[PDB]
Curated annotation (Swiss-Prot), chain B:
Organism: Vibrio cholerae serotype O1 (strain ATCC 39315 / El Tor Inaba N16961)
Protein name (record): Fatty acid metabolism regulator protein
Record has Chloroplast as a keyword: no
DNA-binding region boundaries: 27-46
GO biological process assignments: fatty acid metabolic process; negative regulation of phospholipid biosynthetic process; regulation of fatty acid metabolic process
Residue pairs linked by disulfide bridges in the UniProt entry: none
Gene name per UniProt: fadR
Record Pfam families: FadR_C, GntR
Residue ranges of domain HTH gntR-type in the record: 1-67
Length: 265, 259
């Protein structure tokens, strides 16, 4: 019940129903217009209090953090997801943004560092192949030249069931490579700001991707995407880059939506 | 001489000459490096340390901060001094990026929120028209419908010369409206993330823009730019948008380079 409250009013702060700077509903109140019990509602009003998006304490009651003015300290947090959480449009708007700016830093990458861009995309493709076609995550790790550092980024010690944990580990490794593709290409634009954006969001990226790429169909789609990214780069027809990235954004988004109606909770 | 040192070291923590991953060389062959007394090298090495990009110490080889992993700290903290140390291409990369994403979120704004967007640009344009065409900042502020709220953000008195104070006040005000243009349009894309980006850089924006818009020709250029944005939005011809913004980027970038 807490997770639902969590996500409801979080995404109500985002979509401006409980605007930044407003006083949040006193509480008697807020449990009908959330529609859940309040032992749980303020176990999550303190959860929510400050993971960094509400105010605490006694006499004057609770408003939401900031209007924003400027404290960029801890604004992404808690954080996120999957989307049993927020993501709302937050993660989906971030993803929309990734689709938005990707043709930019990738057009750059393909022009200034054709070189590297091809070297990276080829690397990523090769690795994802050895990942998804190994009969095990342990097999994959056994034959991978980069086993040790993968292990210093990829870990799972919250799932005991080996087969499930291994499915999860493969997902994490694939996200690892998706991130590699985007982050490296972004840094190979020549304008560092893009790469920095990816580095600052790497946690959020890691979790969301760990989730999104538990879907085989996602992994496949992504792998073909990486592929004609490479083809476009090699060919020089950087007029097809935004088509490719847009259609990818579309198909990936439709999968995102298919992991939504489906499945559990 | 101190600022030169500070910025040199900054702007190649930037390009990786001492990449985020390096241990910084001993200080004397740094005075072989590019020629300031280093009595004060250590004053600016610690200067950068304080401001958050080098770490100082016990016995050491003093190495510079994390290398990135986050802390995203507030590494705007803010040796965005203004950007004399430096616009490196940090500010210019931000500017290039601004140019980069502007046609996108402005295309969104003009599509989903045509009338509101038009309204924002008409606002900004009218305010700036009344701005540069007034015989003084004092006149402008006297007849301005938004005086109290301009004054709540635009203020400057560390300058004694009344007339110069009036020029810098004009500059700060024009920057105020430029920011309004970009930030409002970005928040009117429909994806709040853009607007938040501008909000997160608003300090840096405000400075860089204050100085940049201390130039009359900059202000003029900006105003015709705003106008062509408006015309493009009104026409429905959202295909001229990356064109227009590109031209702005070029001309402004040229002015930015000191012309
Ligand atoms: C909206 C989001 C919110 C965020 C805020 C945004 C708003 C404003 C934005 C920002 C604020 C503005 C104000 C702040 C400004 C502050 C600036 C600064 O502080 S300084 C910046 C410098 N930043 C750097 O990153 C430089 C360093 N550059 C790099 O590191 C390169 O990019 C690099 C190395 C990552 C890419 O180079 P490669 O293409 O050659 O990649 P390879 O080096 O070969 O691989 C690295 C590792 O990966 C392994 N690897 C390679 N292939 C692999 C494979 N197939 N599988 C697994 N591992 C593999 C290798 O074994 C290797 O290991 P082994 O590095 O030695 O530990
Ligand atoms: C600056 C900050 C950058 C942030 C990025 C950092 C990275 C993220 C970091 C942390 C998050 C964690 C992520 C980890 C990732 C690993 C796991 C995954 O890969 S999950 C991927 C699953 N797929 C999705 O989630 C779909 C994302 N959404 C999209 O890709 C797009 O929204 C898409 C393709 C679904 C289309 O949505 P539409 O709203 O943008 O476009 P429409 O509604 O269909 O068409 C209407 C208008 O769109 C405009 N439009 C489209 N593109 C435009 C553009 N580039 N510029 C301006 N306007 C554009 C056009 O004006 C068009 O209107 P007219 O054609 O005139 O009628
Ligand atoms: C390192 C860099 C950091 C970057 C950060 C990374 C990016 C993203 C990364 C990770 C995501 C993490 C996500 C967590 C975030 C935590 C919080 C949240 O979840 S979101 C909270 C913010 N949300 C909003 O701000 C909603 C959008 N904001 C607005 O819309 C503005 O507040 C608003 C309403 C002011 C602008 O929209 P209008 O078009 O409606 O403008 P009007 O309502 O007319 O307000 C104009 C004001 O200016 C005056 N004004 C109007 N015309 C004027 C004129 N011509 N001259 C001067 N003043 C004028 C008006 O009189 C008025 O003043 P008067 O304060 O209301 O009294
Ligand atoms: C996601 C992060 C978002 C962050 C956003 C941050 C926002 C701001 C926040 C905080 C910062 C504070 C900001 C305060 C702002 C307030 C005050 C102001 O307004 S200051 C305004 C000063 N303006 C600049 O500094 C210009 C910025 N730079 C640019 O806009 C670009 O660099 C630009 C447009 C100047 C150049 O862009 P290109 O890289 O696309 O152009 P090329 O690289 O030179 O090449 C283009 C192609 O076209 C040809 N070409 C170039 N020039 C040509 C010509 N004149 N004729 C024909 N062909 C040409 C070239 O040969 C080249 O060919 P081939 O594609 O390589 O094959």
């Amino acid at each position: 019940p807490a997770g639902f409250a969590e996500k409801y009013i979080i995404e109500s702060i985002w979509n401006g129903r409980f605007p930044p700077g407003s006083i949040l509903p006193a509480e008697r109140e807020l449990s009908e217009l959330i529609g859940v019990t309040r032992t749980t509602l303020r176990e999550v009003l303190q959860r929510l209090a400050r993971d960094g998006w509400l105010t605490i304490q006694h006499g004057k009651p609770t408003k939401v953090n900031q209007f924003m003015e400027t404290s960029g300290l801890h604004i992404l947090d808690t954080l996120m997801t999957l989307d049993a959480e927020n993501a709302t449009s937050i993660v989906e708007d971030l993803l929309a943004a990734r689709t938005n700016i990707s043709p930019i830093f990738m057009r750059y990458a393909f022009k200034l560092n054709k070189e590297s861009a091809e070297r990276i995309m080829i690397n990523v493709i090769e690795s994802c192949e050895a990942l998804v076609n190994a009969p095990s995550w342990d097999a994959f790790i056994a034959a991978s030249p980069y086993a040790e550092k993968i292990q210093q980024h990829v870990k799972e010690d919250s799932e005991k069931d080996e087969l499930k944990r291994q499915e999860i580990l493969i997902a994490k490794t694939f996200n690892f490579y998706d991130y590699m593709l985007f982050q490296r290409l972004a840094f190979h634009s020549g304008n560092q700001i893009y790469g920095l954006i990816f580095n600052g969001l790497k946690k959020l990226y890691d979790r969301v991707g760990s989730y999104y790429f538990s879907n085989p169909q996602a992994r496949e789609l992504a792998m073909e995407f990486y592929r004609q990214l490479l083809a476009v780069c090699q060919s020089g027809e950087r007029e097809h880059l935004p088509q490719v990235i847009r259609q990818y954004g579309i198909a990936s988004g439709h999968i995102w939506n298919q992991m939504k109606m489906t499945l559990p909770s």
